[PDB]
Write a protein that binds this ligand. Structure first.
Ligand SMILES: [Ca+2]
Lengths: 52, 53
């Protein structure tokens, strides 16, 4: 089990806001890609958020 | 401020540079909000999010 770190605010050039979606895939050299998909919640209210 | 006690119906608000009475100034199509109890400072003027309690 391994964890990929991404500096999103630098990658997209701005911080992602509330009520916004982000989607993607981590695509290996061969084999099926891991889908990523989430919508940031309506109200940020704590420092670490479980986008899941 | 009224999270720390005071009189409703005589609350002021802040147009930049002044303080003026809330209820009398509020426009006909709008509602205003006054925080009466909030433990965790969750309500802010630009984002009034209310949570349990
Ligand atoms: Ca609260």
């Amino acid at each position: 089990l391994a964890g990929v770190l991404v500096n999103v605010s630098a990658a997209f050039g701005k911080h992602v806001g509330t009520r916004e979606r982000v989607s993607g895939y981590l695509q290996p050299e061969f084999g099926a890609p891991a889908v990523i998909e989430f919508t940031t919640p309506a109200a940020f209210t704590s420092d670490v958020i479980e986008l899941q | 401020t009224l999270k720390n006690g005071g009189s409703i119906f005589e609350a002021k608000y802040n147009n930049t540079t002044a303080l003026k009475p809330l209820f009398d100034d509020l426009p006909a199509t709008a509602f205003g909000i006054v925080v009466l109890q909030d433990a965790d400072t969750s309500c802010s003027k630009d984002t009034p999010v209310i949570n349990k309690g």
